[model samples]
Target chain A: ERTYLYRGRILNLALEGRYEIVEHKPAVAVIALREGRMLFVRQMRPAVGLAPLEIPAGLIEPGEDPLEAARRELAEETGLSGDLTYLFSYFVSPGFTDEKTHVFLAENLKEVEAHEDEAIEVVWMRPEEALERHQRGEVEFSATGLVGVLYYHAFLR
Target chain B: ERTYLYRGRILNLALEGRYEIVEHKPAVAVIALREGRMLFVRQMRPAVGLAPLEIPAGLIEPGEDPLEAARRELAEETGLSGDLTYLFSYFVSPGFTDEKTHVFLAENLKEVEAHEDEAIEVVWMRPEEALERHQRGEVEFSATGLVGVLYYHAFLR
Candidate 1:
């Protein structure tokens, strides 16, 4: 759906609207699991006005596959690397905009260099804790955090 | 965001060169585990132009909790009501307007009558098969199917 201004084409569909012509940044989520523990990255989301708990994720670079983007984001954000197993991909908000996110489960993780560009704190916690916090509304709902938690506790289990 | 179209409180966003709020509806996914397999419903989505694999879902009645709506959808569609468990809930689309969807998982399912108000088919499949089909695009996606699959693989494992 497009939301336009200044004579730009805008598509409005109820509660969700977006600009049509501009490119929507693609994204990927790398969910790392080790010995029943999960690695989450806490970062401030200006849109939601809070720091959300999420798996390592990033925008897909131009010409990058979602899996490749997930791999790079995993290493860059968490200073970790692993074999990325493809899980699923979906339109983040088909009800409004057209942001697609690819998700993966990263296994056999190992340490690496963290990206210096973004401000993200790595937090290692149990999957149950992550879900509990989400239910309590402690974690902001986004593609990675909301769907990521679902992947960890409901899908994988 | 507020867009003024006319004087006083008689303003419409669409009239002010913006998308209008048409209507808002509450929805849910009725997920039940039966004999180690998942009960899924296949139906067509008018918006997406293809049939989507989905969980039983419906709107929340006024003054009803989202979980209760989920239970009602499950019982109405699948004819099964076991122990319903709260899983997760998120706004399916929250950008231009405000439409939120809450999700839940049900277990210990017992057979009941299905309410097929819309064109739908019921299928009993292994969770793994469902996941594979979802990935291969053999299974169509809806608000519930996408998140429900991710939740199943992430939390249940």
Candidate 2:
């Protein structure tokens, strides 16, 4: 009962006996806390039309190491680079999509400009402030943003 | 520049000028800690072809509240129920899918049975053990599982 519906640049839709499957590009997210601020990104997600605060994250291209992807995305999204340590990885939504995310802890950030695509605004805030703002109903969070907040509390700080 | 590609049971694929979008069924997750053991579930995901450990979670059907979805998923997945309190929510992957997940903290657990579909195995262990197992490379995690773990360290515990 395997059926392919559409295949495209970012994801492919398929069906395996009612279990709708999305073959997606696995991604990478970089969590960097420079000084006292955790680097975040805000961009227009046309899908939701709501710009949630998230970390510097993007698709990991084929054959590229997740670590290098993290480095590249960080610099491209924010014009900065850091010494990155692989932290953990998880499926974004195992229920339907095979989109996994490899998380990294980035430190010692320095300027490293790179070409980027999305019209994103780089935000620098304490992880606590991000959480606080969410609590205050000032903004929403992407999984990367929430995970970075929890990760900082649990491991980094 | 918006174009629809496919629409089906669980998701809809669209393209807004190359920014591919997946309008997905938003989901809910329940985090239950009973007598120091964290409730977990494992089920095969055809999309990934690998079963990852996760908390009780499922899609919020049309017009169903996220809290009720959490309760229903918990009982159906694990044959248990609890007092569920809304914790927080996050978009699974805003870069592509608009699949947000509402999380709940479940406590004071009691037996409750409901019809379930997936071939899931219920698991109970200390959250620390879950974290340790993941660290020891004993198993993989879904976003729900990883969030539960980090949430335990950051907020629940």
Candidate 3:
């Protein structure tokens, strides 16, 4: 039997049988590369306490498809927009949550007005640099961020 | 001030100001490649209601480090152990949850006693084949699964 424990902003908690499930809004992420560097965003994640490197990402709002959300997040977080194409989607951690992330690849980029809200710093780094930094114990990556690097190696490179 | 709404088996819900957070146990995952095929485990994740393709992974228990957890999960889920080494760690979704996953690369795998419990199916497939299948809409990948594919392309390939 499914019993909901808490329903709040961003997430909901429920238990079905012995499964501790989290009901989350599906999210969208953008991987935008330009001039041999990837666009990244770093912000203080209240939950994690540390700001981890991440791709431009946000939750998919009602009435906005994943592509639209990707575009919005990309522009809002990075002050740019481009041709957004669906790459792939994966459940962030299906072992306990339904938070799927739809990733989009953005090419032919151009500048746009960025709606600055959160304290997210838009960063640009070569994928090699990002991976090297992580390897040298300098920075940590969020799943979206790592996916962006891995996607480049798997397809682009 | 902070307030907790639900403290459950796998996760705890807390709210500080307007940020809703899920406190979760740190998890460990193993990526093992042998004979040109990658080791994967497919099991019905009750939360997502689908058997997502995933690498061997589980939460780190008390007194055991992430490496030990990866080794144990590798053996339990796939009946193999390897030279486990730390790869990297990432927050599953730092936007709202504090669940971080530490990844390990397991190599030189040898068959060991598998502690079978769940309805998990061990699948071995080439990284290229797995990527192609996911591209063709045949199988869904968990973050672990995607990372494995990307890791192969980034390093092995």
Top candidate, metric lDDT: 3
Query: What are the per-model DockQ values?
Result: 0.23, 0.77, 0.81
C-alpha root-mean-square deviation, candidate 2: 2.3
Candidate 2 local lDDT, residue B112: 67
Distance (Å) between predicted and true CA of B107, model 3?
1.2
Q: What TM-score does prediction 1 earn?
A: 0.67
Error of 3 at A43 (Å): 0.9
Instruction: Mark the 10 consecutive residues where model 1 chain A has the least summed lDDT.
Output: A14-23
Instruction: Give the range of the ten consecutive residues with the poorest summed lDDT in model 2 chain A.
Output: A112-121
For all predicted structures, in order, the TM-scores are 0.67, 0.93, 0.96
Give the lDDT of residue A136 in candidate 1.
Answer: 85
Error of 1 at B44 (Å): 2.8
lDDT of 3 by residue, B34-146 (tens): 88898889999888989988989999999998988998888878888789889888889998888889999987888887454668789899999998898899999999999
Per-residue accuracy of model 1 over B88-131 as CA lDDT, tens digit each: 66644232223456777788777777352656677777677887
TM-score of chain B of 3: 0.95
Point out the worst 10-residue segment of candidate 2 chain B by lDDT: B109-118
Candidate 2: CAPRI quality band: medium
Better of 2 and 3 by TM-score: 3
Candidate by candidate, in order, the iRMS in Å equals: 7.4, 1.0, 1.1
